[PDB]
Amino acid sequence: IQRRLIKSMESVMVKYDATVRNSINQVVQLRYGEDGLAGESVEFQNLATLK
Amino acid sequence: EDVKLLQFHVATMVDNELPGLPRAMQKSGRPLKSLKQRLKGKEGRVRGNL
């Protein structure tokens, strides 16, 4: 299951205008992860206004 | 018959696992390793060496 999965997604990558596109240069997302943030720099937070 | 035999030998040269067809063998009885088999699996050129 892991080998098959990597084999699909391998060529997707964030380009220098920050839209995420695969090998034939089709757009996957307009911004990576819909906000353009990094996954190792995020944290869990509480939203005050749902009070 | 010669054409049928030639057609078989050149086919078995390229691909030796043809469905419904006998397979090429040796005195050992081992199936021949044709070019498709060499490419095909985990131990094949595409994945194993390349």
Binding site: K7, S11, S23, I24 | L39, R47
Partner: protein, 50 residues
């Protein structure tokens, strides 16, 4: 296997995954052109991957 091959990616990528000879035979027969734009084709070819 039967879905990834419907993608409009270059033929050499599709060979690197389970289809081996068969996708190359069809690629040769249609005469498609592989633009070496993706990660696998470039690593197999040996030039610095993008």
């Amino acid at each position: 296997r039967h879905g990834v091959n419907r993608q409009d990616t270059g033929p050499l990528m599709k060979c690197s995954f389970e289809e081996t000879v068969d996708v190359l035979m069809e690629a040769a027969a249609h005469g498609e052109s592989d633009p070496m734009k993706g990660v696998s084709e470039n690593i197999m070819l040996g030039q610095l991957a993008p």
